[PDB]
Design a protein around this motif. Structure first.
Motif, PDB file in Angstrom:
ATOM      1  N   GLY A 147      11.903  33.492  38.341  1.00  0.00           N
ATOM      2  CA  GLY A 147      10.933  33.673  37.277  1.00  0.00           C
ATOM      3  C   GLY A 147      11.331  34.703  36.233  1.00  0.00           C
ATOM      4  N   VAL A 148      12.566  35.196  36.293  1.00  0.00           N
ATOM      5  CA  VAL A 148      12.977  36.147  35.271  1.00  0.00           C
ATOM      6  C   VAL A 148      13.043  35.383  33.956  1.00  0.00           C
ATOM      7  N   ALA A 149      12.901  36.106  32.857  1.00  0.00           N
ATOM      8  CA  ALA A 149      12.940  35.501  31.536  1.00  0.00           C
ATOM      9  C   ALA A 149      14.367  35.447  31.025  1.00  0.00           C
ATOM     10  N   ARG A 150      15.098  36.541  31.198  1.00  0.00           N
ATOM     11  CA  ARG A 150      16.482  36.609  30.714  1.00  0.00           C
ATOM     12  C   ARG A 150      17.351  37.307  31.738  1.00  0.00           C
ATOM     13  N   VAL A 151      18.546  36.777  31.917  1.00  0.00           N
ATOM     14  CA  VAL A 151      19.486  37.379  32.820  1.00  0.00           C
ATOM     15  C   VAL A 151      20.450  38.263  32.035  1.00  0.00           C
ATOM     16  N   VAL A 152      20.660  39.476  32.530  1.00  0.00           N
ATOM     17  CA  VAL A 152      21.557  40.402  31.868  1.00  0.00           C
ATOM     18  C   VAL A 152      22.951  40.245  32.465  1.00  0.00           C
ATOM     19  N   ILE A 153      23.906  39.830  31.631  1.00  0.00           N
ATOM     20  CA  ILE A 153      25.297  39.640  32.052  1.00  0.00           C
ATOM     21  C   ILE A 153      26.164  40.800  31.589  1.00  0.00           C
TER      22      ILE A 153
END
Length: 225
Positions: free
Chosen positions: A84-90
């Motif tokens: 359910g995260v909105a954005r993944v930090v890469i």
């Protein structure tokens, strides 16, 4: 926007106790439109990714959460999004395998991904990318890496100076189609004001909130001027 941040190790905020949920809920109640979480456990070992805890936190607030920490594979990205995260930090993977990560932009969309770059200004004034504070520069400038991802629609970049208002003015002006986030260097409310005119779209604030220097509400008021 102001982007409140929390680091998580085995359920504990870093040692500021082990109940991140009421904190995050109060960050949102004060007007935060996005929250930033780092899974330090997952960063140390992706097999121990705190997926259950992330589900709970995301479920417990009403604003998008961007989450990072040990995002190494396409399956890592997918698992976080499914939780359910909105954005993944890469972070490191964005520097080490750009062609693979470009594939991720193609699959998941630029709205789902934030590239987190640590930057050192070297002796020749070049903004060097490094994969962490502990490691040498990796031999690619911030501009070169951004331009590597622009053809797959890069939209969100999180930039940490690990060596600067000038830095943010320059890169923001050079790439106005990108929304840059700044991280680090916020020790008091005046540091937020200093970033207002720069073109930075988001300001990540972590430690200052935990230390009670100012509140999310005050940060937002300052930021919105």
């Amino acid at each position: 926007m102001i982007i409140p941040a929390l680091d998580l190790i085995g359920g504990t905020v870093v040692d500021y106790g082990n109940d991140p949920l009421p904190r995050l809920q109060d960050y949102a109640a004060q007007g935060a439109g996005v929250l930033h979480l780092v899974d330090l456990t997952g960063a140390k070992d992706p097999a121990k990714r705190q997926i259950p805890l992330i589900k709970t936190l995301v479920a417990g607030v009403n604003v998008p959460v961007q989450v990072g920490g040990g995002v190494r594979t396409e399956e890592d990205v997918a698992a976080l999004l499914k939780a359910g995260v909105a954005r993944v930090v890469i972070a490191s993977t964005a520097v080490k395998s750009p062609d693979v990560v470009k594939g991720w932009f193609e699959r998941f969309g630029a709205q789902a991904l934030v590239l987190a770059l640590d930057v050192r200004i070297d002796e020749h004034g070049t903004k060097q990318v490094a994969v962490s504070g502990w490691q040498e520069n990796s031999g690619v400038s911030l501009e070169q890496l951004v331009e590597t991802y622009l053809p797959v629609g890069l939209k969100h970049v999180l930039c940490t100076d690990i060596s600067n208002v000038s830095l943010y003015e320059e890169v923001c002006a050079r790439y106005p189609q990108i929304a840059f986030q700044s991280s680090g260097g916020i020790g008091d409310i005046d540091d937020i004001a200093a970033l207002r005119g720069t073109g930075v779209r988001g300001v990540i604030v972590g430690r200052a909130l935990l230390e009670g220097k100012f509140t999310v509400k005050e940060a937002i008021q300052c930021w919105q001027n």
